[PDB]
Symmetry: C3
Subunit: 449 residues, 3 copies
């Protein structure tokens, strides 16, 4: 079938105390409204009409989906009024699903359910029964049939007793929506245009409204302040964790895990406490990730062991690598099979070959390191003259003594050995020993301050 989605995101989010549009505040690493658009496109929406009021600049900057149609609502005179603005783009032959930009957790499964329930020529409405229905539009039925919605401000003490409430999500046909929308007036408590009136209009036209319910309450919870955003973030993380656990991923504490992106994985992956996964992360089989690690946009091969407090960004680790604790891999770091990176080591745009080790207090940037190479503690590749960055190349079987600086550009041939404390400014030959050392001397009977 055909269907388009309209997302209302023109409301003011003052209880957030922010200089950023409310629907842009993130949850799980992404804008609240991006979550809604994702569900919209995942549902098959043909067009996605974003109705906004202000901060349109900040909005277009952050939102760049293709099926995105921007609709301005200069004045917020109500949800019905906001829909009136988008109406012009509705297709008589297409279904129109309405959503809120501040209700991020709504699921596609529930939206698919609502979809299939919409009566022909009728309306699909999503409702939930709440313990305390205060503030919500009340659902009135006659002989068991939905005949309308009474906003909290307008309901009578008696109607206020109804616990079935309107969540705000509904689907109808473009043409229908258009005829009803045109007949809206604002004679009411709030003195605005209620999109909720269309339920009545449709009913007295003979049409029928069907009400389906969500799988969970959080599915239709809206965000008006940062406490509510916080709450939903935990709900989301708890769901993510459950899925992973049931999928074979062991989490040492599901309450202390955060997934802010996408995780692909093999079998027997084990993740300890307080680990954060961001962007796109791929883990091979039997990968072990110690406590406190932050992994972002990286590939980690089979049998890798990431020790506690290790930060990895845009890195690529081949099989059987061991890194950490306290290691920092920056964009471009690559570790071939069996490579080892110890504590207080930083890598950026550098490849460490098979079986090579960089054990301690080392900085490797803009470097190409061969296999079975040993980088002594304190080694640093000085890759920047203050204007340009230069490359350092270290061949296979090289042994770099502790506290060596390699002033780029420089190449060290296979099997070379670099004396501890050497400042390397010139290429080193294969099988040669490079050194720039002052012989050690002594001064007898020396007294300090």
């Amino acid at each position: 079938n055909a269907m388009s989605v309209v997302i209302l995101a023109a409301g003011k989010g003052t209880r957030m105390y922010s200089d950023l549009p409310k629907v842009l505040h993130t949850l799980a690493g992404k804008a609240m409204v991006q979550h809604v658009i994702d569900a919209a496109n995942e549902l098959g929406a043909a067009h996605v009409h974003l109705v906004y009021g202000h901060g349109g600049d900040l909005l277009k900057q952050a939102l760049k989906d293709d099926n995105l149609n921007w609709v301005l609502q200069a004045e917020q005179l109500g949800t019905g009024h906001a829909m009136q603005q988008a109406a012009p783009f509705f297709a008589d032959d297409e279904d129109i699903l309405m959503l809120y930009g501040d209700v991020p957790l709504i699921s596609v499964e529930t939206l698919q359910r609502l979809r299939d329930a919409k009566p022909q020529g009728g309306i699909g409405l999503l409702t939930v029964k709440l313990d305390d229905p205060t503030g919500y539009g009340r659902i009135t039925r006659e002989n068991g049939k939905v005949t309308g919605i009474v906003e909290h401000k307008d309901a009578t003490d008696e109607q206020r007793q109804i616990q079935e409430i309107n969540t705000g999500i509904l689907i109808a046909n473009g043409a229908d929506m258009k005829r009803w929308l045109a007949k809206l007036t604002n004679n009411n408590a709030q003195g605005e245009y209620y999109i909720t009136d269309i339920i009545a209009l449709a009913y007295q036209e003979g049409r029928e409204i069907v009400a389906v319910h969500p799988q969970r309450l959080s599915e239709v919870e809206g965000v008006n302040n940062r406490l509510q955003l916080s709450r939903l973030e935990r709900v989301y993380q708890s769901e993510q964790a459950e899925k992973l656990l049931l999928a074979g991923v062991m989490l040492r504490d599901p309450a202390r895990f955060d997934l802010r992106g996408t995780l692909t994985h093999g079998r027997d992956v084990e993740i300890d406490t307080n680990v954060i996964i961001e962007g796109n992360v791929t883990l091979g089989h039997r990968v072990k990730i110690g406590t406190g690690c932050v992994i972002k946009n990286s590939v980690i091969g089979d049998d890798c062991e990431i020790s506690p407090y290790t930060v990895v960004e845009d890195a690529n680790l081949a099989a059987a690598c061991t890194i950490g604790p306290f290691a920092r891999l920056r964009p471009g770091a690559e570790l071939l099979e069996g490579a080892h990176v110890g504590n207080f080591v930083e890598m950026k745009k550098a490849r460490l070959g098979k079986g090579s080790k960089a054990g301690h207090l080392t900085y490797l940037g803009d470097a190409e390191i061969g296999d079975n190479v040993n980088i002594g503690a304190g080694t640093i590749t000085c890759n920047y003259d203050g204007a340009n960055k230069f490359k350092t190349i270290i061949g296979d079987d090289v042994f770099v003594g502790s506290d060596t600086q390699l002033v780029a550009p420089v190449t060290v041939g296979k099997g070379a050995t670099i004396a501890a404390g050497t400042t390397v400014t010139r290429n080193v030959g294969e099988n040669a020993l490079a050194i720039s050392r002052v012989p050690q001397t002594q001064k007898e009977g020396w007294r300090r301050p």
Copy 2:
């Protein structure tokens, strides 16, 4: 009006298994009893009478408030007896509020409520209804009026059914308190002096006792062991977190945040998981604090980005700074606008000028660094001859090569450049290149062990 507070802190805290007075064990970074004194002074108490038994030495050492009057209770013969000791200092014309030193969460709002309820010449009593009232003094009323309190040991099976219990907090007039206190005897189950008897004495004198209730149960919960202290700590942290969230501060996980001091803040501040705030911390607008950071007594300007696992103490960061991950700023560290501090870098009593960068494996202590300065990786300021510490000064536009030691005291002029691996013992001129390098040589066909 006039009012004084009496804090009972002379009881034994044996279930703590500690060599430190029970009321000194901290909650949220401060002694349990300091919490009570804070509420007392915040309520306007004129005098605060601390009734203690032992560890008076450790107590005076830790408690140094001005309105503090120490009252010794050599023997713990009961709460009534403890009040008898403080009685001599009560003012006939002042109200006397009684509190417990091991009930830290009592709120000022609830204490203010009790204050305004106290009948003229009567007593203000705080009561709570509990599911299991075992162990607590039972509140007896007649025709709906509080006529006394029956301690658990003395109540009858029937009175033990009463669920309204005495929390221990009450307020009365100095003179009244004095006449009643003098009439206390210890004929009872426990064989001690119950301050709770004054309720009866006042009633048969014709006076009236009013009972107000707390806002929350935790408000009047007492601490007898470390599990209970733990519980209250989480309650306290949860309240703190809520306030911040509602005030515009985004916390990625309110359950993984700890505030042990005071936090001032601007708008759009974002705090990730497991961050600890201690002492007095001020955050400008849009400050981002990554996971695992510990921030103590520091000032952080607008737009600063603190990366994961960064420890900051008594530091001052100007606007737009970026520090971490794995950075350690010690007392005296100062970063001017746009300064950058990378991983595995430590600063102590050192100022890093505008746009200056200290990227990796570096230690800067007792240093003054100008603007647009670049401190190569591995650089260390050797600020201590073993007896005294000395200052290092680096002018603007200086470029310090990797692995350079600056033996203090030394000054590097503007625009100078220091060769990688240099040991700087003498001042460097402006626009000069300093170096102390051995030319690199090679030994052909070298074989390692």
Copy 3:
């Protein structure tokens, strides 16, 4: 009395999505089944019969207890059938307790209770009443007496209403067990051998079955997937935490603490958030452990202060030491009294004497350091020529300048002083100043790229 235990561990654990036997997946640092064996031996079991199906190789590899008797169950035809295999080794004069290898939390106290309840010649059965008894064997009683168990598949709608269910744990005499086991047939819903039938057989023999209940539900919860394992891990950690709190150990957040081994401790020990304890750890009096520390198999003396994010393995710290933040102690690290280790410092097979300090960016391996020694920042002991490792010895009162490398083997005598930036290849005399420095020179008017 005499008693042997049989542990069924031959079932398939497919919902784990693992290549490792289900009962080998760990909880609190140890294999699920090791937990059961521990309780078995702690209960006094004489023999422990492990009934397994596959992965026997991986099982024997990981399990090496002495009283362990391996019984193969090539085909899993039911629990009764599995017991039939172990039957041959039962002693007519001994009690036989049956347990599950995937029910790790069962307690010895509850097992001791079941023990003492077993009627003479009867059966001790453990039962729990569940809200939703679906899937569990149903307990049928007549006139209040247990007369059998009806498996869920076989119960009638009416029997399915019974909420008292069989947990699977039972104890009986060897001889009895043997006669009943021999009379089992598999005419039933599942078409297998139910060990649960023996309850009926015993009843019609005139014997009596007694049902005792566990202290907590988690005690008899089984693990079929990683979500359930996760759940139990938290239950276990929560219990551990409670015990410690009640024993005098202060935990800043009992929900953020993990004990995966054994902890011995003194008084007033304080542990902050996110600390992990592994293997055997001993803490003296008043030890303070900051947030994020990982302590494994170490000894920590009185008054030690471990700062945030410090990793300690197989270390030994004397009294009053201070280490961290960001410190890494590896196997063999030893700190004598009052020693200090700062940030970004790593130690391995090295002893730091009384009052000695290694403040920053330092690596000490295979070293012996005397008392009152000061290791300047950037110091590194180059303990490996690429084939062998060598020892570095530093006498008392030595002062090592920043960025010094000590090429092992080398000895520095008492009171010596090593100039900053020195490469030490030869022994240094007592009270001598060692140096290998190029005098600093300057090049006027130097311009960078």
